[PDB]
């Protein structure tokens, strides 16, 4: 009954940010120590909780969302941010309660010749709602003429590729991100840290 964080953090392939993955965690013992005692993480920011006291708390359930973005975009995975990622790919609510963990994955997700598997949504009519996941690939109409599913002037495929090559500067390197959100409804708590 021990929470499967290894399935999340150590997955061989991560999702593209536009199609971010979500793992529901329930009915298990958390043990966040293995996370916050790791030197491997370039970012570990918590909101509404103390990482210190994580191992002594309970929640109705936990969500672990995971994806890959550019280094320069990690700052956008936080309440109250704007930008292409927060606006069109992955949006945290203002009242977010949880942790954002990010680490440089240049060794896994960069390829000499450039890895282009990971994509982000560049065109969208409006901002995502918090925790909204948009996976449409409909041609984006930027002008007054209908696209009818054909790419051309003013008719753009909405997803665009990151170009991850090992010699990129760090702001252009891929980072793996896991967002833990902690959910407290009005039901029995099924995710507790080891001291509970």
């Amino acid at each position: 009954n021990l929470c499967p964080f290894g399935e999340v953090f150590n997955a061989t392939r991560f999702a593209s940010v536009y199609a971010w993955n979500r793992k529901r965690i329930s009915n298990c013992v958390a043990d966040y120590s293995v996370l916050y005692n790791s030197a491997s993480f370039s970012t570990f920011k918590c909101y509404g909780v103390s990482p210190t006291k994580l191992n002594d708390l309970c929640f109705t359930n936990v969500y672990a969302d995971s994806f890959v973005i550019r280094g320069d975009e990690v700052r956008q995975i936080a309440p109250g941010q704007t930008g292409k990622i927060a606006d069109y790919n992955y949006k945290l609510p203002d009242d977010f309660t949880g942790c954002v963990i990010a680490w440089n994955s240049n060794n896994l997700d960069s390829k000499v010749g450039g890895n282009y598997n990971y994509r982000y949504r560049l065109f969208r009519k409006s901002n995502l709602k918090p925790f909204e996941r948009d996976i449409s690939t409909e041609i984006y109409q930027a002008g007054s003429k209908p696209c009818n599913g054909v790419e051309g002037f003013n008719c753009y495929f909405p997803l665009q590729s990151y170009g991850f090559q090992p010699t990129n500067g760090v702001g252009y390197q891929p980072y793996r991100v896991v967002v833990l959100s902690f959910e407290l409804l009005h039901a029995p708590a099924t995710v507790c840290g080891p001291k509970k």
Partner: antibody
Amino acid sequence: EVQLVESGGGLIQPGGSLRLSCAASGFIVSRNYMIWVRQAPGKGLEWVSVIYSGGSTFYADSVKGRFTISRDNSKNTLYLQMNSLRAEDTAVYYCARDLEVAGAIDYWGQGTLVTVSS
Amino acid sequence: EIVLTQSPGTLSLSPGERATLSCRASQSISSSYLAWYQQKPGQAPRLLIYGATSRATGTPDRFSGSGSGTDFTLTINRLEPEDFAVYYCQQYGSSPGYTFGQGTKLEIKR
């Protein structure tokens, strides 16, 4: 036909205000990354401001707090409200459509001259 | 903030010759985020190249872009009198989101 037609430029005293406007045809302003870029006389290009189709806005450090970019969906036009103008804001201001990695700044208006002077 | 330094500042070449214009960024940027523009006097800039190498619509094949990391190049083969202009590189991948080089002025000999 697609086009971007700018207007509103003219002479203003330092400290004054001016509102630039950019009427679009073909392009749907509210569906595009729309930018203002300026060029002082004899000098290079300097990005000023951007508004995203979702509404997010960003500004160059040199105009932050003084300029405000906006748009009117019903008029299909983009605006740049310029407050507390100084001599260093004298320039030709271009509005332009930005496509980022899908095509960079592919379409530019023809520019309107703003002169800040006593 | 990133700085784009173009070189040379001025260039004088004969028709038929080949112009090579450089852009050196103060830090490494991905090639997907670099573009080149041509500005003729009294006109808006015209996009030549984006993503370091992709020709914009209307750009003839004698214009070609290359480079990566901190160094990018615009090459103009078989120069013509109408190529007289100022050429600007631009990056759009790093804060504040857009930065132009200071331009290379190209004069055509005769």
